């Protein structure tokens, strides 16, 4: 026997199954649809194996995904005094929305397997999606091209408003083929919106001569509007805050810095909570990404940072005018870290547990 | 179980006279959805995902053998690529494995296998457009050499379908609507401040100077006439900003709007956006906007205003929407604000 | 037949890189699937629509010295959108994948791809949005588990079988898009002091504070190849400034960074820019020199001074380059022009 | 009929350099769950029980013949059992059945016979920790002698299981954590009563003098940088005193905590417990330190506080929790306070 | 193992449940919060006003 | 026509080479690095490592050439040659390699 | 596969023919 420079590690290429599962998740769980009008939609989420636990768990580790049947359990808590009802059904196709709400209920009820109930009613739905194939995951890179990754997504509208406390859930009893076996990483959390459609955040501006004039604040829409306590806070958004909560805005607000001599506009692209007298308390302002400091902070004229041409920082501003906005339920605000990084599912419900 | 199979036929584009199409100009180049046959549209706007079996283009030309010049059609089987925009569009189109050349006396019938892939029947509402789901391919009839006498063109689609997944939707969403001339320009001015003239919509024939867009221009341009409630959703947003005492406020400008002026006997047409306090677009005329302060009331405390100078050509695409910006229907539109009946599109 | 054929061949698919510089983890070959990746399929598949992978066998050229110690692990994920993690957690993530392995650094492989017998589109899509999953059947991998301890020349080559299907000719229509070669700087803009002479100017900041103008020797280090007064970039995102002058004011987005000639033409710098109404092209906003229209349809330049937004731009940043009108600029018109270094995937 | 049968394969050890260990160390000694594995563990968090159909070990060295010495490996199939942590526990691991002994430059696959018994697929949370239940046995690679130079291994994972009973579990409850050096401990001293460092922890490295325990510090110790609101829960809890004017009362203390000091700028680390009053975990400070009387108002009557000594080696394991004392997941943490990435653990 | 689960609140009372078996003795659920939906994972578990 | 190319080192010696065919005698390879995978896309296309030496044959297609270039008129070179052998130095020998 | 200190180039003893 002779010896080598060296020998090498025997070459083996690693090869997997693809599977056939079946489960149930809770799919979506609401409180208190009331305060929402007819048409509105309390449930509408886009099917992907990301919104259930344990099929996220396990399509996590396969590329691609193949919907045999899906079924729906919609169930609603409010008892049997409350009057009004709902439409539940699911659209297969992931890109449509549906009319206003107004009108949505017929569109919805010409989907097959939609049915029409009062709120102390349930509905159950068979749905299935033969011969198709799809992802398990948007595309990180290109552009989101919503049907790859999609079956279509499953709807609740308000037919009649109800009259008392009617939380909803749905409940997904699915069974899938998954193929192509990879491991992604752990799912980024998704959009934010209200759980209540009677309120808005707002951003005023306009009285430049007051304390709280680049703060988020909470309007029932009938009156004048409140500074957000976290309390409140937690009525408008389902949890509560704290003091590293930041959000990215829909639609950026443009905000105007100011002092003698010096002048710049500033994009406000994210809501931070700051802390709001001497690290005891918490508020939410405007904010944006600081090339000083390198993470998103609110524009506060006398603590925001820029650099000059000669490269030094400097925090030349004094004052500072915020255009007015206005939030709605309809909004969607993505949770992200400081560097506008989204943060991951389980660290948010960590740091956010619901109710 | 739900799914059918529908025969059918249609008329694609309506009659239109190539002689005054220039060489290089396509008469049809049009992107196969349902939603162009009336009969094969009315049916698979309750469906979701859709086959096509069949497809033949009837391309019918009713003129005598004296007329001179031909036509060149085919199929580009991607929803994605798109023909040059020259005279060139006529050699990449015969590269195409589809692809008649025929005098324009020479009526013809062209068949066209199609991949048989399911396709989804509409374009995406949600997340991004990606063209190639919904549509198999364009169709294109284009000009080789410009018709020497009137030559009247007309095509027809002999289809046949599978269509698959019930759903139900509306003829549109929203519509687009451009320039019907392409010698002129809509224009915003607010260079010259002290003018009472900024901020309103007007039109410059590109040499001439530009002057008030009345009714009559507006025909002229848009291929229909304007009204008191005449909303449109622009492209770009356009910048704006507000003074007052103590007071300052930025404003886009995402809307060009029509209002009423001189007790309502003529209409004018501004710069316009969504109003927070009385939720409807108002054409952002300092003394007559409102806001809120932190309290909640509604002040008007804007006296001075600063337009932003933008163009818009014949490239543009408006979108009409009410006011409330809920964007109007095709059908609606069409019935609201007549054009001209042309087919495709 | 025609509309249809069945074609052969091999290609390089990537040319040499020296592992020895890579941090553990790093890919040295992350290249997804699309036939222009090989000079003579990508040619052919111009020519038409559709394609089919029937084969795909991937040579590994490892060619690092049968002392040196390490290996590396390469595999072939079955998604065109999905993105490996940055870090040293990509190998294991990578060997899950099926058909994963490692082997020595001075042992070349020939892996053979499974390719689903689906038919992707031969390109990228002129019209509409980008769905990467249509045309691209995966990404094939090589990370280095263990950085080599000395040099590593290491290349891949591909064996392909496939078949091409409904005929065309695409323009081919194709446009570039840049970012940065280096990532140890940025470059930025400045708004303050109000008063300076290079206020709006592109500069670059290195790690080192101070910023500095582009020599443009400077410029050729960050974009990895040389400027030309004929130089125009279109931004991400558009840069507020605000001109002003005698009792006239006006907001202007800059869209893009153009090149400029700088006192007497001998010398060229770069500044921020927008389309100009009035010109009909790309112009560098200052304030002197932008013109604009008025009520009357007359041209004017009554701007005496203004004020730009700080900005940076870092390697993550694309630009595209576009002749003044922001017309795209074909990929060989620009390669020519600006020709950066050769290599392989571009 | 929920059960299915899994094929896959998982790095199991990332890449480390053997060169560095000393003789009779173990590269690996990893009791076989299925949460090592990536793959393996993700889709088994949605399954009770499994059953190891097939195990195969791949341990690679990638280096060349010129590396001295060798590395000995097996399968010990018993979770209770272990092995004999000196450079005797190689002779051990060689007296069970599998066991390879190869050269450094030798790289191996290792199949393993598993009892065909079915496993329950993660410890038990509650009663008591009957280990064999969940774990079939452990793997090794321990070092035999040092290689002579750099020599770089890793372990892969063949694996094919059956999953039974369906339920989920999160990737943890909680995570423990060590210290990164040996040579230095953590204290706490209340000796010097007067001192105003009682009760804050600190770090001696073992033949020194301790000092203050800054973040600098903390790193080289824990291998990440602490923050505002680090918390752990103490292995063994620490005896405290607190007194005032007619007051006194015992507290354990149950966690590390920090706290920020001199207005924020830096922060300290102090024993600490839960604050019925707050509902919070807080640093027992006396004056800081609230109590209910009977009629349930709440005190801050103490002044003085007595503080009992204790140490922690590198053998003591924390937990993070967060105040109000959730123990905090190890993905969770591993995203607030990241260390290096190395994979088994 | 076949359980029966009846709640005596009449009509009137809103809210709800969530009932199923985990078939592991040693498992302790999420503190409640998020409880819900792991139970529900577990087969045969229902959901109920 | 068979090509020996030697290369006479240890197999210490890293990088390799790239060899090839191109059956024109007017096609001109690109004069970078590029050259390599141009002549990579030419139907006989080895890479070995230096420390591996090989032999190549080529079928050339079998037309007469003349055997010398043309004194008189034009410099018509497909009629004399039938197209050159390359090999490149795809990453240069960490060592003498001869 | 193993790795060898070296691999030696093929031998192959040129061979010629005789003509007329
Ligand atoms: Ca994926
Ligand atoms: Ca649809
Ligand atoms: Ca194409
Ligand atoms: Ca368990
Ligand atoms: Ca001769």
Same mark, same amino acid.
């Given at each position: 026997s002779v010896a080598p420079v060296a020998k090498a590690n025997a070459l083996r290429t690693t090869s997997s199954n693809s599977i056939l599962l079946k489960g149930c998740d809770r799919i979506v769980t609401v409180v208190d649809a009331s305060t929402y009008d007819a048409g509105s939609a309390i449930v509408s989420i886009p099917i992907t +194996?990301?919104? &259930?636990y344990r099929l996220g768990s396990t399509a996590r580790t396969f590329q691609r995904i193949k919907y045999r049947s899906l079924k729906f359990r919609v169930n609603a808590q409010? &008892? =049997? $005094?409350t009057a009004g009802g709902y439409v539940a059904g699911f659209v297969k196709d992931a890109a449509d929305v549906l009319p206003? @709400? $107004?009108? !949505?209920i017929p569109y919805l009820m010409s989907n097959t397997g939609s049915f029409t109930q009062p709120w102390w009613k349930s509905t159950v739905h068979n749905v299935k999606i033969p011969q198709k194939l799809f992802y398990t995951?948007? +595309? =990180? %890179? @290109?552009?989101? &091209?919503?049907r790859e990754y999609c079956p279509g997504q499953f709807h609740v509208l308000v037919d009649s408003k109800p009259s008392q406390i009617c939380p909803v859930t749905v409940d997904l009893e699915w069974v899938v083929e998954l193929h192509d076996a990879t491991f992604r990483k752990e799912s980024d959390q998704t959009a934010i919106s209200a759980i209540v459609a009677d309120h808005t955040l707002n951003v005023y @501006?306009? +009285? &430049? =001569? !007051?304390? %709280?004039? @680049?703060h988020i604040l909470i309007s029932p829409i009938g009156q004048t509007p409140k500074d957000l306590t976290p309390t409140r806070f937690a009525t408008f958004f389902g949890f509560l805050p704290d003091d590293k909560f930041c959000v990215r805005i829909p639609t950026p607000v443009d905000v105007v810095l100011t002092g003698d001599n010096v002048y710049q506009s500033v994009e406000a692209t994210h809501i931070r909570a700051y802390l709001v007298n001497g690290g005891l308390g918490i508020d939410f302002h405007l904010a944006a990404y600081n090339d000083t400091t390198h993470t998103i902070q609110p524009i506060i004229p006398t603590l925001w940072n820029v650099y000059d041409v000669t490269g030094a920082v400097t925090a030349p501003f004094t004052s500072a005018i915020y255009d007015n906005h206005v939030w709605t339920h309809k909004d969607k605000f993505v949770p992200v870290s400081f560097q506008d990084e989204p943060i991951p599912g389980t660290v948010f419900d960590y740091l956010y547990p619901r109710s």
């Open positions: +194996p990301d919104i &259930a409010c &008892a =049997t $005094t206003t @709400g $107004t009108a !949505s995951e948007a +595309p =990180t %890179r @290109g552009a989101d &091209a919503v @501006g306009l +009285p &430049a =001569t !007051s304390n %709280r004039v @680049g």
